[PDB]
Design an enzyme around this catalytic site. Sequence first.
Site: not given
Lengths: 290, 290
Positions: B67, B89, B115, B175, B195, B198
């Site tokens: 990624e 994804w 991103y 995120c 922001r 988990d």
Amino acid sequence: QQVHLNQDEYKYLKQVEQILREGTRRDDRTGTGTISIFGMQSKYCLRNGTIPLLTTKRVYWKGVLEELLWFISGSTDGKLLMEKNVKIWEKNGDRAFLDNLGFTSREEGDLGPVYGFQWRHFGAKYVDCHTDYSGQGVDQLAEVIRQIKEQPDSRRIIMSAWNPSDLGQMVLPPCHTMCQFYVDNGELSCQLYQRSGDMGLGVPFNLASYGLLTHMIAKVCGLKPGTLVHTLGDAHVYSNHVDALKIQLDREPYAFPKIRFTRDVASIDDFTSDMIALDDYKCHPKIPMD
Amino acid sequence: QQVHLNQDEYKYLKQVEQILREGTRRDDRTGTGTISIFGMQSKYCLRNGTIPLLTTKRVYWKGVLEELLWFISGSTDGKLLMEKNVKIWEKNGDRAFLDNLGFTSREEGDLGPVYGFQWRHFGAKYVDCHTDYSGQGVDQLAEVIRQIKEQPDSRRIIMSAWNPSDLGQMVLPPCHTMCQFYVDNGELSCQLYQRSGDMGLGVPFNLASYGLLTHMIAKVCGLKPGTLVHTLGDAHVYSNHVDALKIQLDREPYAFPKIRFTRDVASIDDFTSDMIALDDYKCHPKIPMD
Ligand SMILES: O=c1ccn([C@H]2C[C@H](O)[C@@H](COP(=O)(O)O)O2)c(=O)[nH]1
Ligand SMILES: O=c1ccn([C@H]2C[C@H](O)[C@@H](COP(=O)(O)O)O2)c(=O)[nH]1
């Protein structure tokens, strides 16, 4: 042991002490020394109208207040703020400052696409500080308000001043770079990410500014104020300011003042400086700087 | 005890524990319960090749690594990742997911201006995930690298994915919204603003990702790795993960693995998966739950 009337301002002083004790000693943008920690975080209770204006060293409340209202209005015209008798941006918009940055064509006080423009018109094509930008770019402040009202559980309530496309045209790059809001049990909380903070002047000002912002938005949204979370990248003290900060560290903080709004507001755009009152701001004596 | 082989992972566990003890109960956008604290921050040492891949619960390393390379390439095509057997994804770029958002003309895997696009072309006009964007928008990553090499004192080394103009066209909003870099005595540090996190599944992955990125840029810039500062907005644990996390919390962390690059690189665009070695990633066994 640690019993304090104003624990949050005490923690601030602890923050400054930690910088001076553990910080790295580097030379900065201007060739002056700073003493610096990268990555710091602190929290300030905003409940019952408390606004964190530091009591151990006076913060220019009038400047905080007028600059915020000016930000909100979308204005990028330094002259508007000078009309309110606040001069903190004056030196960043004068002929000499502009010309040094290559903005020779630009009118004095035209600060470029800084905070106000980004908050209200992120993405729009900047022309000058006199252009009407109505319905151009994303109105982030409006969206944040809708999100708080309609989707209070959201983890995406974000406003950002950091616009890479526009940085070259700003007189200064954004310092308080973005903020996030959060609703918990009818309380509004805010986290500021500030990339760079001077603990002797800048940080106390930014602290009060976002404290005030959270109070205003809470009122607009029918919510109670919650917690201000203040996050820093480069937290620093200028090395020439160490004696002055040491005097500040020696003081037992007073209670923070309280914010009071004296009429109803129709929206975030409906506040004026005459209806925002600050009760019982008591400060320790002046600390001379160099 | 008070002493640990891996104090940094130990602090992460204490972070999870603080959320469970002090966190607020909420029902989020998904529907499942979270327990949440707004505003947290933790630090992870990266010195001497250390990368904070959690040991008490294994992290999907292949996903992290592929990624990131994909992010750096500027790609927004989910199929390139699927070609490498990374499916993180997939759910977000398939027919039903795209159509549900109204992207009914998009090919599968067209994630929008996410991103990678923001990192290398902030402000460019998004067309699709096959369009050549050379010289369009701000190459934030290249500027970051330039600033680190040429102005290491800078308090302005920022990269942001938060682009309000493009949010509507992203399959998911960013995120990990932005990061700041910091150079001290030839050591490179990075602060991530996240922001929403988990703690169970997302955060460990984000930690490893930005850890790796910091090691990569450090190599490119002829510097040494420093510290990763991880800052959270809504730090949360999913209520159905509670029992498995309690198991994880009684585990004693092993030492973090170390990262090793096995050849030189010409630039940030010159890494490949085969030359990024991960030494000594030893984990505790899988948890009896998901
Ligand atoms: O809102 C602000 C603006 C500036 N500063 C301080 C931080 C730095 O000392 C200096 C700005 O310099 P750079 O970070 O841009 O170099 O002013 C603040 O604390 N808050
Ligand atoms: O990089 C990521 C992306 C997502 N999440 C988690 C956090 C939330 O639980 C969820 C995303 O939901 P929102 O915050 O976008 O609602 O996935 C992460 O931890 N890291």
